[PDB]
Amino acid sequence: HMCDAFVGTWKLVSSENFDDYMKEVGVGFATRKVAGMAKPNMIISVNGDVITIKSESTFKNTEISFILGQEFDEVTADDRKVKSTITLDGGVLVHVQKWDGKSTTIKRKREDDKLVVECVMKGVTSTRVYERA
């Protein structure tokens, strides 16, 4: 029941500072432009210990399945090949991605009727807000 409040289908409703976050990550111009336009759906489900997060957009479709605390390989929407570990910290899903000696952290939390996603790369944060579809 660890992630019950995350389960469901979510639609992006607002974004702040995502272009700057993507720049800090190293995303190139054309990908930033096309990824920045998208309004992805995020579909979260749980089966036993396995959590699945799928993102459906006009830009890319991504999917990760994972067990908390257990490192996995991820191909990001911008085509980075990263090593990811996701844990629960005080009710927040904390997702760390490592690649090329770099690191970024994505936090997902429930706040009121929203699912709030905070992406941090060094000093730069982006906030992406989702509501139930």
Ligand SMILES: Cc1cc(S(=O)(=O)Nc2ccsc2C(N)=O)c(Cl)cc1Cl
């Ligand atoms: C490039 C990028 C995308 C995402 S994303 O919010 O998950 N957005 C997403 C997921 C599938 S398609 C799609 C999109 N914008 O088209 C994140 Cl968190 C971090 C980075 Cl660097």
